[PDB]
A paper describes a structure:
Whatever the precise extent of conformational changes during catalysis, the results reveal a central role for the TPR domain in enabling AspH catalysis—without it, 2OG turnover occurs, but EGFDs are not hydroxylated.
The N-terminal region of hFX (aa 100–105) interacts with the AspH-Ox domain and the C-terminal region of hFX (aa 106–116) interacts with the TPR domain. The Asp103hFX carboxylate side chain in conformation A is positioned to form a hydrogen bond (3.2 Å) with the side chain of Gln627, whilst in conformation B the carboxylate is positioned to interact with the active site metal (2.6 Å) trans to His725. Notably, the highly-conserved hFX tyrosine, Tyr108hFX, that is part of the consensus EGFD sequence for AspH hydroxylation, binds in a mostly hydrophobic pocket located between TPR repeats 5 and 6 located on the concave surface of the TPR domain. Unexpectedly, in the AspH-TPR-Ox substrate complex we observed a non-canonical disulfide bridge, i.e. between Cys101hFX and Cys110hFX for the hFX substrate, in effect forming a ten-residue ring. The observed hFX disulfide corresponds to a non-canonical Cys3–4 EGFD disulfide link, suggesting this pattern is required for AspH catalysis rather than the established (Cys1–3, 2–4, 5–6) disulfide pattern.
Residue numbers in the entry:
A (entry chain B): 99 to 116
B (entry chain A): 330 to 758
The structure:
């Protein structure tokens, strides 16, 4: 689930670790 | 207030406080050894184990090591496994475990922790809410919806549950249903309800239903520092970037890119048409609930700064042309894609997620009339072989009322005022 044109997702970023 | 010492720990409160004191003074290094010494001496001590966990947690921050944080995550688990753990300590330890598991992206792992916390504290409403967030982070809106439904059945007034339930409802295109939940939820003022996401989606939902009270909420979201402005409502921003709805090529500084797109526009067009005729399956329908009606599909070549190898085999010349321009192929908060829209299409007013990109539109096939795009208070039209540039972090809207299809090429670039290091470090979107 990605935020391409809008802000539909709860979070648009997906980070892992430091 | 929080009681963390069981019967035995109270008898060694001095040794425990001594070690903890070393941790607070930043001397985390000799604090680890202090708690580890206590863990050897008192292998069943929950407070000693928690101390070791917290020290490992701080060592992870200093060293930035995922490995030691992984270790801390296990030590937090170890606390909950010991006998006679005080409830406050058990909750604190497992909550932090979940928090750090999400940090590492162990969302599946975090879920089990949150599930366990709910199992251990069945009457703690906030933990059920946290579980709901856990489901949301993995894209499991169905299970998330159940959780908040369960919370609301017991606690109808919980604002946190209402905003999130509302958020889930709108995401499901339950626009009318979502509005009172988002509204009442934000109005509750409960912790975690003052979030830009809920202002953003409450006003959007209101716009779709013709409720003119939408911008009152946008104004409030702006007043509370969620939006750069009432018109520009992106939530993933670098504060300070030049903000205007429409840009000229010169203003962007990307004149070479624009030259290339406009000089070579026909090869881009022809590959797009070839895909339409011989491989239309590569065009995927828009799937962010942005349409009121009609047909709108996109054929993406780049996303999050990553080239789609298979897609580029359908537009090889176009991909080759674009390789020369890292300002777009390296834009990890944008895409490069064909965009086809057919008659009878209206795209709702909407806003992109970030102010960190500008969006170029190259006209490929543009009917003489019926097609137009509004950004902020200005509406414009496309031209074949010509580039339009706008900041899609501003509210923008689109119509297609021609008598044939409309094809454009979309090229996202880093906001020109973003430094090279920002372009390097910003997480993808
Ligand atoms: O592609 C279209 O027709 C409409 N495009 C947009 O709304 C956009 O570029 O973000
Ligand atoms: Mn858009």
């Amino acid at each position: 689930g990605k935020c391409k044109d809008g802000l539909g997702e709860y979070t648009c970023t997906c980070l892992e670790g430091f | 207030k929080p009681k963390l010492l069981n019967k035995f720990d109270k008898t060694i409160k001095a040794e425990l406080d001594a070690a903890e004191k070393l941790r607070k003074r930043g001397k985390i290094e000799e604090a680890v050894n202090a708690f580890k010494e206590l863990v050897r001496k008192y292998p069943q001590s929950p407070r000693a184990r928690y101390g070791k966990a917290q020290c490992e947690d701080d060592l992870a921050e200093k060293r930035r090591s995922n490995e030691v944080l992984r270790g801390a995550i296990e030590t937090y688990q170890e606390v909950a496994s010991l006998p006679d753990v005080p409830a406050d300590l058990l909750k604190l330890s497992l909550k932090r475990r979940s928090d750090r598991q999400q940090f590492l992206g162990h969302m599946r792992g975090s879920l089990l922790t949150l599930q366990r916390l709910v199992q251990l504290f069945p009457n703690d409403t906030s933990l059920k809410n946290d579980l709901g967030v856990g489901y949301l982070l993995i894209g499991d809106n169905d299970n998330a919806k159940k959780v908040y439904e369960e919370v609301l059945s017991v606690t109808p007034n919980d604002g946190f549950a209402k905003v999130h339930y509302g958020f889930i409802l709108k995401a499901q295109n339950k626009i009318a249903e979502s509005i009172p939940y988002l509204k009442e939820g934000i109005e509750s003022g409960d912790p975690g309800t003052d979030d830009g996401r809920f202002y953003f989606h409450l006003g959007d939902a209101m716009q779709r239903v013709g409720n003119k009270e939408a911008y009152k909420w946008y104004e409030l979201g702006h007043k509370r520092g969620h939006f750069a402005s009432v018109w520009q409502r992106s939530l993933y921003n670098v504060n300070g970037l030049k903000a205007q709805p429409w840009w000229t090529p010169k203003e962007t500084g990307y004149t070479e890119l624009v030259k290339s797109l406009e000089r070579n526009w026909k090869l881009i067009r022809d590959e797009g048409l070839a895909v339409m005729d011989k491989a239309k399956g590569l065009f995927l329908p828009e799937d962010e609930n942005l349409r009121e009606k009609g047909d709108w599909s996109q054929f993406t070549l780049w996303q999050q700064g990553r080239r789609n190898e298979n897609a580029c085999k359908g537009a090889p010349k176009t991909c080759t042309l674009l390789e020369k321009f890292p300002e777009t192929t390296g834009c990890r908060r944008g895409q490069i894609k064909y965009s086809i829209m057919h008659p009878g299409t209206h795209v709702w007013p909407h806003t992109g997620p970030t102010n960190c990109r500008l969006r170029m539109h190259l006209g490929l096939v543009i009917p003489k009339e019926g097609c137009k795009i509004r950004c902020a208070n200005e509406t414009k039209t496309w031209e074949e072989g010509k580039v339009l540039i706008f900041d899609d972090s501003f509210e923008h809207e689109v119509w297609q009322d021609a008598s044939s299809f409309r094809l454009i090429f979309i090229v996202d670039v880093w906001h020109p005022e973003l430094t090279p290091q920002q372009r390097r470090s910003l997480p993808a979107i």
